[PDB]
Design a protein around this ligand. Structure first.
Ligand SMILES: [Mg+2]
Ligand SMILES: [Mg+2]
Ligand SMILES: [Mg+2]
Ligand SMILES: [Mg+2]
Ligand SMILES: [Mg+2]
Ligand SMILES: [Mg+2]
Lengths: 301, 301
């Protein structure tokens, strides 16, 4: 039902082993809420997503990303539930900063994140580490804002939600990981160039709004409001199906916008231009992978 | 210092009478905190800004816009002081929604004065434009409640989150809306929401807002406020003030160059719409230069 003009890509050749190793790591780190087939299948699903998003990565880099996918799904759920079940924003803030603090210098999640970070950190330069950390700090701010909305029993206005969703989605982190997974790093002058930044935002919006459309049933069952469809219903005073259609239109316009923008990328140098082209291709791969996965993942379905 | 590539324009020829009339309206409505000459000169200065920002508007439209400039300065200051002096976000939210609720109809000096402005503006605009303005007001309210959140939590927001929220707290999207009202030429939703046009609107918002942060830093820090690009840079990048001014100027200048490029590739819609879009973009240019010339000399900063 959504515009997805990007072709599918063969997943990483070691996808099966990746899922097995990742599941064992999540268990050993104590991150599984239970050992039901539903829970284990979800972890296997996240690992399938990772293997389709970064199909050309060296195995051990993909393994670290894969661990982060599962770690983040679980910890974001913990932080969401903390807020949904009535915690003050200060408590949500303390939880996030306490766990993510290991990126600069605590229950199951701090130690497990430190383990991921030790492996990723060894394969990346400082300027990229600061870039990822900033995107994490952006996400934390976005999550504390969500917690404030819940404390105030508020549905955010659409323009503000769409902006903040770019942070809560963590997709900027997963663009960062395109560089890590390919071992091809872009200088700040490139990713911060306003045209490239708008490409990154558009791809974020495509993936995040697709997630919203497909994750709507789960989030509404959870009494959560941070979903483009719910936000559209409240702002425009429309019913669910009409809001789905508006959300799809917004998604599709971002797709068209992305495709236009990437035809007019700024130029820097033969080497940087080639790395930027691989980075943008990585975003295209991620978008299609996310699209196909969202339709079938048991997390939403 | 800051890049301003947009030539200046003569102000509205009735600028002097406009300032006199606006001051008398501001006094009659009871919005003046006191009758000192520096308070009165602030109103005169904001009316001078209005007369430079919409120099071709019919006088009665410019007059309503002018009353809103001064109304907004005073009321935004009341909301800032409410939060700076310890109010919980819910109190800030209630103050804002109670006063701005009159944009939807009759429901305090500020609410009555806003209703008077809105009665006049509404008589000269279609419904879709009124909803657009009201939505941008609601975005700004969300932005202000978020600032109150940060102050309650003693948080300096990370830069990317601040820059996105600053687009709403600046109210510049409302003043782009007023370009349509001032010229009595209204763009359909499909045009202003087109992602390329939206990015033009955002870039212009950033140019004006980040210039305002740079020039309005000395007074915002004497107010114990952190919602300023320069301060946000110091905390995020761990740099000293002059370095942060330099970074902020570079970010401003990159948005300017981005804007200059984007407006050469506007989408086409129809004969009349394209003509009106060209006037709208030119209005943003006029506004940006008018704001630049005024910010350097205004008593407010
Ligand atoms: Mg979430
Ligand atoms: Mg979630
Ligand atoms: Mg979701
Ligand atoms: Mg303000
Ligand atoms: Mg202010
Ligand atoms: Mg300011």
């Amino acid at each position: 039902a959504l515009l997805c003009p990007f072709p599918a890509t063969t997943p990483h050749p070691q996808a099966a082993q990746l899922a097995n190793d990742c599941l064992e790591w999540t268990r050993k780190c104590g991150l599984l809420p239970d050992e039901s087939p539903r829970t284990l299948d979800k972890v296997r699903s996240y690992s399938a997503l990772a293997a389709h998003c970064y199909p050309d990565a060296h195995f051990e880099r993909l393994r670290a990303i894969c661990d982060y996918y599962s770690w983040l799904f679980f910890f974001d759920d913990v932080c969401e539930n903390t807020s949904l079940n009535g915690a003050e924003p200060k408590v949500v803030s303390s939880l996030l900063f306490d766990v993510y603090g290991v990126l600069r210098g605590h229950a199951p999640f701090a130690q497990a994140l430190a383990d991921i970070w030790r492996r990723i950190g060894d394969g990346c330069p400082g300027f990229w580490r600061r870039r990822l950390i900033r995107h994490v700090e952006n996400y934390i701010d976005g999550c504390v804002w969500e917690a404030q909305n819940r404390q105030l029993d508020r549905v955010p206005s659409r323009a503000v939600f769409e902006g903040m969703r770019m942070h809560t989605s963590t997709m900027y982190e997963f663009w960062d990981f395109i560089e890590y997974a390919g071992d091809l790093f872009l200088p700040d002058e490139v990713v911060e160039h306003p045209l490239v930044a708008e490409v990154r935002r558009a791809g974020n919006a495509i993936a995040s709004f697709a997630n919203d459309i497909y994750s709507l049933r789960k989030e509404t069952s959870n009494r959560d409001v941070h979903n483009l469809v719910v936000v559209l219903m409240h702002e425009e005073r429309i019913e669910l199906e009409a809001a789905y259609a508006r959300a799809a239109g917004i998604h599709d316009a971002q797709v068209e916008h992305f495709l236009d923008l990437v035809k007019h990328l700024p130029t820097f140098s033969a080497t940087i231009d080639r790395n930027l082209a691989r980075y943008v291709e990585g975003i295209r791969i991620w978008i299609r992978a996310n699209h196909d996965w969202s339709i079938v993942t048991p997390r939403y379905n």
